[PDB]
Amino acid sequence: SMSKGPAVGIDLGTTYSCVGVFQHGKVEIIANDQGNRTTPSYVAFTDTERLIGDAAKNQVAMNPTNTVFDAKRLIGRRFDDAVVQSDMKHWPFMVVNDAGRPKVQVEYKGETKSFYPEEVSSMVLTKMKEIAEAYLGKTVTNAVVTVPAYFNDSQRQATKDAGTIAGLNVLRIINEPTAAAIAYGLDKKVGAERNVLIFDLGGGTFDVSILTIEDGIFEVKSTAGDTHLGGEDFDNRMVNHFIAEFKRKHKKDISENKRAVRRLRTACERAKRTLFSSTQASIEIDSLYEGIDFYTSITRARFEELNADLFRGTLDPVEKALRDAKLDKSQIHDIVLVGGSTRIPKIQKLLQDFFNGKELNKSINPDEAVAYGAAVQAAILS
Amino acid sequence: GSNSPQEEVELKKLKHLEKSVEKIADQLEELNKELTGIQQGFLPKDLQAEALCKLDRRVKATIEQFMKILEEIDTLILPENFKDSRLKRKGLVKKVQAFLAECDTVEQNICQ
């Protein structure tokens, strides 16, 4: 058997999770068995087995009703919560009421089974624990797990319970914006009280948090955002643009052909990523629809135009959080970028311009900053 | 007759994708033989429905594997001068699409 390993930091995300470890004086974000530094927060139930992470996400098209995700949207909530009722309409899996508490209901090995959200999140946490052990070659038990700043007592407790069910010794539960500030060493900056704005646009949610750090104490001053905003919305604008382009060029509508739309959507997702660092992206899809080859391109400028209202709209929760925190924008000492969509240059430009040219804390991979801070906290608590 | 060493790289990528398609096509071939076997076989008419619907998981897995191949082929960018690569890419996508049509035929014949 393996020897005892270090404590880890885990970012349990709505769509993806990330695990880091502090060692040799730095944080190492751990790649999973497929070499991915983030792992889908997905659990699938099949005729023969339970699948977690990439293996679960990879078969979603094959088994949609029995592939659970978004458990974080349900954890610690009552069935009648407005959020649960609104969210349920859009999920392919069933959510049932068990004495006031939501449960996901699935078919597993030919039988009807139901799980509490913390049981689903415990399975994701077990995979994160296993990812850390496979990399370290040592057993992992101790972890710092993160939660959104707006989580209430029930949501926080249910997350701690997911950790316990997973066999983790949860050293501490810390807020996601606090983990991001810790990653950048914002509590270590000398001087007076610091006002920090965390701009977190990743994994299908948009969260703005304002924190004040004074003598190493973090206080959440305000939170704002959009629960359902992310990369998929930006990808969809591109898809609409291309479907319209195909109609103009060929007088054919590819929208009802699910495989054609999927090939196009996958290519749009990739082009969007190319646009993070390139000003243009090319797409070549042979035989997209009715044997027609679709060879096209999109500039970063066109991508920005298609998404102009959505990008400029990210400043509304920034203004709302500033008003709730009773602070002028000029009073914000540090701006931190978290989440994959913050890689979009236009989003960075809009935020930097809003803060009158102020440099943004963005050097840490945005997808990993929260796990990075959690791993730093885990090392401190060891 | 201006064949470049650069195109050899793309042709090698396409050959690997062709090999990957051949493996999935072997899975489809077994599904087709099993479907034919059930439709033309001696199973009591009462047990045929169950045998056919047992192919569901495999046919969906086969469809998904082909869709992942198409998404990988869709990442290639081939200049006009790479005529051999473009022809190989076109031929491969057409081969995958014809296999997906065969998968769709299996789905029309099971779990009805």
Numbering used by the authors:
A (entry chain A): 0 to 381
B (entry chain B): 149 to 260
From the study:
The 70 kDa heat shock proteins (HSP70s) are an abundant family of ATP-dependent molecular chaperones, involved in many cellular processes including protein folding, prevention of protein aggregation, modulation of protein complexes, and protein transport between cellular compartments. HSP70s bind to extended hydrophobic sequences in newly synthesised and partially folded proteins, in a manner dependent on a cycle of ATP hydrolysis and ADP/ATP exchange. HSP70s consist of a conserved N-terminal nucleotide binding domain (NBD) with ATPase activity, a substrate binding domain (SBD), and a poorly conserved C-terminal domain which terminates with an EEVD tetratricopeptide repeat interaction motif123. The two main cytosolic HSP70s are the ubiquitously expressed HSC70 (HSPA8), and the stress-induced HSP72 (HSPA1A)3.
